[PDB]
Amino acid sequence: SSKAASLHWTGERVVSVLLLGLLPAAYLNPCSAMDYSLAAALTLHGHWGIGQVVTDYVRGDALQKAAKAGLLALSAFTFAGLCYFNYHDVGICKAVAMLWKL
């Protein structure tokens, strides 16, 4: 029937292999286009990451929903900042490069 939970499981693997493929790609081809894709994959895999953690340890009819939203806000605020960083600042790729030769 309606493949809901199985598709989300696949979705986590799809972004995980993508993120695995993007760490050497950002190193070999550092550009302001690879900057955003890294921010996209880093936050999505991170959101579905902590998602599993919350649905595991947190038990509650009322406490579960608040954490789902509390995480969603924190993820949106994370992804927004990285896109702001890739626009109005140095940008992840060049930013790490600067940090490493310190």
């Binding site: 921010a39 991170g46 990451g49 605020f77 994370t78 900042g81 702001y84």
Partner: peptide
């Protein structure tokens, strides 16, 4: 994720 969040969070 704590590092990734704190990096983008302090960017704003």
């Amino acid at each position: 994720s704590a590092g990734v969040s704190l990096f983008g969070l302090s960017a704003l």
